[PDB]
Structure 1
């Protein structure tokens, strides 16, 4: 069973601009995804200081980059905390809450403020290079979910029956035909060095 959701109006407008722009500096999509992987890895790591059991779903904390020229996909896999179904719907489309209003609400509720920024908006830059994005994600004590969109104003969420992940997030970028440089080892190495060199987790490029 598949559920379809509309992007919030301003996010839909942003995605339309991203899809139709000739913006030159497209390589920064990778920085934005690796940065969210690193934040997800920090989260399961800090959380495992008070609850060591949260790493039963996988001890290693890392990021893998997997180009596939046959499928024309670039996959980014991390073993971070992963996303719940609510995280997918709320943060990857339907809600755009200001950090300030979220901060006020957290103060009044006595809740922590660590998520007042959601996951940001920089990751929509993936549509500079991808015509479709699939996200497979697995959070502890929740099921494995697949999120998908080709940026036509909507996205889908379904329970994933594919290969189990353990814990974390996998972003599959189905690249546009003119953006296949991001499957080239030399190009990926270059942009990791320029924009993601100081991430505090191993970033491993898989060779085809």
Structure 2
């Protein structure tokens, strides 16, 4: 069973702005997704200090960057807290509403797309480079889920039939035809060094065979 949901009006408006605005500094999507993963790692690490059993699903706290030229995909894997079904459908979207409204007002007031993170809606910068985004996630208190959106005002949520993850999130970016530079090893290295050099977790860039 695949459930289809409409995005909150403000979120749909933000996604349209990200996809339709002429903005060359697209590389910022990577630091935004790395920031989301770093926050998820911080959350599980903190919670594990009071309840160590929260790490039974995996002790390693890291981020993996996996480019795939054949599939034209860039995958960001983290062993963070993961997201529940309620987080994917309601919680994060509700939280993002105020930030989205504030960001769009700031953009009208003279701010630029790179400031997206200051409003806590950085996840949506994935649409600067991806035509479709697939989010595979597993939280300790829930089943493994697959969230997906090609924008256009809707998203889908289904129980993931694929390989079990243990705990964490996989963000699969199905890249736009003219955005293949983000699959090159030296380009990814340059972006990580420039914007995410002080992330407190190991960032491993997987090289293609």
Alignment TM-score > 0.5, same fold: yes
Change (3 A) 1:68 1:52: same
**Would you say the 8 A contact 2:96–2:120 is kept in 1?**
no
Change (3 A) 1:108 1:55: farther
**Cα RMSD between the aligned structures?**
6.8
Q: Aligned runs of 1:33-182 on 2, under 5 Å? A: 33-91=33-91, 93=93, 96-98=96-98, 120-182=120-182
Aligned equivalents of 1:163, 1:206: Cα separation in 2:
19
Stretch deviating more after TM superposition (119-128 or 51-60): 119-128
**Would you say the 8 A contact 1:98–1:117 is kept in 2?**
no
1:15-51 C-alpha deviation (Å, 9 max, x unpaired): 1111112201100000110001001001100110011
Gaps of 5+ in 2: none
Using structure 1 for the length normalisation, give the TM-score.
Answer: 0.88
Aligned equivalents of 2:115, 2:145: Cα separation in 1:
21
Gaps of 5+ in 1: none
Aligned equivalents of 2:45, 2:35: Cα separation in 1:
15
**Would you say the 8 A contact 1:7–1:94 is kept in 2?**
no
Aligned equivalents of 1:27, 1:113: Cα separation in 2:
11
Aligned equivalents of 2:186, 2:112: Cα separation in 1:
42
Aligned equivalents of 1:184, 1:169: Cα separation in 2:
23
**Would you say the 8 A contact 1:132–1:174 is kept in 2?**
yes
**Would you say the 8 A contact 2:136–2:145 is kept in 1?**
yes
**Superposed displacement of residue 3, structure 1:** 0.6
Aligned equivalents of 2:154, 2:9: Cα separation in 1:
11
Aligned equivalents of 1:138, 1:104: Cα separation in 2:
31
Change (3 A) 1:22 1:146: same
**Superposed displacement of residue 90, structure 1:** 2.0
**Superposed displacement of residue 120, structure 1:** 2.3
**Would you say the 8 A contact 1:79–1:167 is kept in 2?**
yes
**Would you say the 8 A contact 1:6–1:94 is kept in 2?**
no
**Would you say the 8 A contact 1:91–1:118 is kept in 2?**
no
**Would you say the 8 A contact 1:82–1:169 is kept in 2?**
yes
1:97 counterpart SS class: helix
